[PDB]
Amino acid sequence: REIVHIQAGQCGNQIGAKFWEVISDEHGIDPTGSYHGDSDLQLERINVYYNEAAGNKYVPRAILVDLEPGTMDSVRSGPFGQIFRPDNFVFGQSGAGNNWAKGHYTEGAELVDSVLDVVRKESESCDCLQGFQLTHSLGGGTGSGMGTLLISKIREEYPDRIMNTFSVVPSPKVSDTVVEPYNATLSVHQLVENTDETYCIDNEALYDICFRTLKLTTPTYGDLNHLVSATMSGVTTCLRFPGQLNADLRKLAVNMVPFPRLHFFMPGFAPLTSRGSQQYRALTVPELTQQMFDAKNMMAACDPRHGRYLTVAAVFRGRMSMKEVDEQMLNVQNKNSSYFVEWIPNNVKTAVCDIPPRGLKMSATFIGNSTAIQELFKRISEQFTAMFRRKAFLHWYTGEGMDEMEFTEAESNMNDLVSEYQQYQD
Amino acid sequence: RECISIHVGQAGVQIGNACWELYCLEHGIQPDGHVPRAVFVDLEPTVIDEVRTGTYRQLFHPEQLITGKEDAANNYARGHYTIGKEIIDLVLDRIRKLADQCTGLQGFSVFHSFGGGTGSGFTSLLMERLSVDYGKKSKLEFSIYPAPQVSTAVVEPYNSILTTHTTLEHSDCAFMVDNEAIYDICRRNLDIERPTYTNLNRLIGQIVSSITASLRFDGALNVDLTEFQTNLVPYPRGHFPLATYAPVISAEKAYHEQLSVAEITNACFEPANQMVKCDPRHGKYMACCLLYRGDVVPKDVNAAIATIKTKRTIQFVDWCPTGFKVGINYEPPTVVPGGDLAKVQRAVCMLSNTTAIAEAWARLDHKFDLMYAKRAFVHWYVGEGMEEGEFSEAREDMAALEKDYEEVGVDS
Amino acid sequence: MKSIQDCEPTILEAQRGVKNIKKQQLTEIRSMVNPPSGVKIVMEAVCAILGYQFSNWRDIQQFIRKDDFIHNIVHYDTTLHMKPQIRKYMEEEFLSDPNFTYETINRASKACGPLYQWVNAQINFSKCLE
């Protein structure tokens, strides 16, 4: 069963830091790595995510990849730094120059072996290795270029494990680098063929939700990450606790992807509320469904209603009646009936774990697979062409040995992918 | 004497787990007396783990809780071929150390579901391997079939149409029940708003007791498994009766204890207690086996059946003159403390074969079709060893099972 | 006549065949970790034709996994009029044995057929070059 994390890049590293913060807490593991959790129930699966080093330290099995040494020295100095094993840190040395080509050839191309190794040293640890999580960001250096190179090696090494990817897709209307379309497109092409689950988080949609749904003054990058990290825990770990209907990753995936061109989901979390108005009653389930199916609770910026959904999968986690669950689901399919592709009979794939996530009385992740996500690759595709046309920064790529024709490819390719997505919209 | 039991799947173990309690409780088995007689198989550890852990640890002798470590999944193909293959052996072996142990057993209660991954796949080839080693025993399966509206999967139709054609030709007798139709009862005739897979399981846990446990209690007019198959097929096709159990009444809202044979018996025929979302009110019955248990004196019974026989709104297929085997076992129903049901003194587990189930296949056939028309999730199956044959040809089969249940009405 | 004419509607045949192969149909094909035997054998025939010779399933995954998977198929040779020694091989290994037959494979997978025709064409053409 066990499974193996990978944090590439600055974002991808940062998030990591909250994520192991989360998980750890959900098994009551100290920062030192010694267990002090609440109930035995915990401990039983830990395995999934840890390794025991010597009856005390449970060390996370992760890999931390980055070319800029300043990175790693912030994470190991964090509140949960102690918990790794130093080997796990694989830095580069060079800068992560924001150039996909510099990542995906050249510099990253050097560093690869010093990763690939470690992944085998880790794989041959135990059990049946389920898969890899890869978190990383499409904007930075190491992420789109180099990290997209990485997978292609993993997917040659174990061409049968799953690959979850959390990409921090760049929010086209709230920019932060001027190469964005180069860094996005060059990777997406590679991505769409080698990974089994991609979870797109539009960075500002993430903003929004914190400033408007939860309502905080100041959304640090730190916050956001914190919120995200609940969702990728909200998928998996969760199922690694006994429930009423345990169905994870494999199941999960194979409930979702009808055609084989991968498809990307859009995560949505659920009992998320302002601090003050947390006070007003709820938590019974219709609110959770209330949440989830709203556009302002998508962590991805396309708003569903401009698409339909193809499959949707709610992984709940508390104590409750399956009838009031199954029931909701139904209603939802009738109230928003035009938002569903028809030739799927029943869309929702309910799964229901048990254990609650710490302070909450019960929570519930949503993973929706909508055609609304066409409207993301459009944006990207636009930006690209518009500047490809004038070859704007092109030389920094060209100069590393990338032809232009790759630039055609990726574009072509990726544009056609938008195409697909509509064909099964209407 | 006894008759072994097989729980397969994410689901199936849960059912077992309830039931096996009740079952034991009924004989008053100490939570430490003579060891159970069954097995539990499933590939994803997590379910079985509970049973190695929760109360009822002692109760089984480990060997018989077989588990995979590998990814079960949720899709026939895999479950049939690929993964499941590995396990089969180990399993078969156990049932032969347990088959050879017992003397003069009778058959296999399978609990498999078309939900969980394995439930379909596995079972399919398990039942195959059974049919060869024990070609003559009895193979009665309680399956959980997927409701019309509520569903919790999207491979649902696929996952059950692949199981059907094979199970037809390996099984003797299939009970069907479905979740959706069970909840209803829990609201209406039992009045709770908390159903969980753990409540419904307590329920099925009753219907099953009416076969074994109680039969293992002598009374006025005991019945037998062959007796079933005999009285319930009506042609040689592994036919699909539907089950119903009847004095389901909420304790405390049962001071209404002026409650008799006549009522509980009449209380079966209403489609309100249908037990699967098919209303037989426009089907034809064709053979019913009313098993009673508790204080029942034959006559009443044999009168209450007359009344039914004369209620007219029920139809009954022509060419059966009489179709009511009657079972009386003695032993009052027993009630689990965690349960809801009320400690009645007589109950009726009537089962019966009806041309109505034409319904139930249709809604499910339909589903399948749509999707197959797009070739929807096909690559998940293909890529596991399944063939496109197995698809087209498992439709066609079930088509011609829909023809039998159609034909078998209107014979004159 | 100036044309040799021998097996020309085989080169209109192999050609309609290569346009019968859809790129999404390749993606569906590549995803299958372990498909029926009927699927496996067709893929072996493709390694031999493309000139990657023999392959075990493990190896086939490695091949298709390449980025030139679609590219090489859609860009493939006009005529393999050069007669490789794959010519007698592809028969001794595939056309020799009836397992490799349109029906078997087709029933195997509804995705195979066009692929099966295309391979067939590269063979029925290879007979006329002798």
Numbering used by the authors:
A (entry chain b): 2 to 44, 47 to 360, 369 to 437
B (entry chain a): 1002 to 1413
C (entry chain M): 3095 to 3224
Structure paper excerpt:
Cytoplasmic dynein is a motor protein that utilizes the energy of ATP to move along microtubules (MTs) toward minus ends. Within the 1.4-MDa complex that constitutes the dynein machinery, the heavy chain plays a central role in dynein motility. The motor domain has three structural elements: (1) the ATPase domain, composed of the six conserved AAA+modules (ATPase associated with diverse cellular activities, AAA1 to AAA6) that form an asymmetric ring-shaped ATPase domain; (2) the linker domain, which transmits the powerstroke movement to the N-terminal tail region; and (3) the stalk region, a 15-nm-long anti-parallel coiled-coil structure that extends from the AAA4 module and contains the microtubule-binding domain (MTBD) at the tip of the stalk. Furthermore, the structural mechanism of the two-way communication between the ATPase domain and MTBD remains elusive. It has been shown that the switching of the MT affinity of MTBD is achieved by changes in the association mode of the coiled-coil, referred to as “registry”.
To stabilize MTBD in the high-affinity state, the codon for I3101 (instead of S3097) was mutated to instead encode cysteine, in combination with the V3222C mutation in CC2. To elucidate the structural basis of the MT binding of MTBD, we performed cryo-EM single-particle reconstruction of MTBD-High in complex with MTs. We also analyzed the complex in the presence of DTT (dithiothreitol) to examine whether the disulfide bond formation in the coiled-coil affected the MTBD structure in the MT-bound state. Without imposing pseudo-helical symmetry on MT, the structures (including the seam) were well resolved, with a density corresponding to MTBD seen at the intradimer boundary of αβ-tubulin. Using a cut-off of 0.143 for the Fourier Shell Correlation (FSCtrue), the overall resolution for each map was estimated to be 3.9 Å and 3.7 Å in the absence (−) and presence (+) of DTT (hereafter referred as ±DTT), respectively. Since the local resolution of the cryo-EM density of MTBD is ~4–5 Å, which is not sufficient for constructing the de novo atomic model, we built an atomic model structure of the MTBD-High-MT complexes by a flexible-fitting method. In both the +/− DTT complex structures, all helices of MTBD were well accommodated within the maps. Although the density corresponding to the CC1 region was relatively weak, the CC1 helix was well fit into the map for both DTT conditions. Interestingly, we found that the DTT(−) and DTT(+) structures were very similar to each other, suggesting that MT binding, not the disulfide bond, determines the MT-bound MTBD-High structure. In addition, the good agreement of cryo-EM density corresponding to the hydrophobic interactions between CC1 and CC2 (asterisks) in both conditions suggests the similarity of the two structures and the validity of fitting.
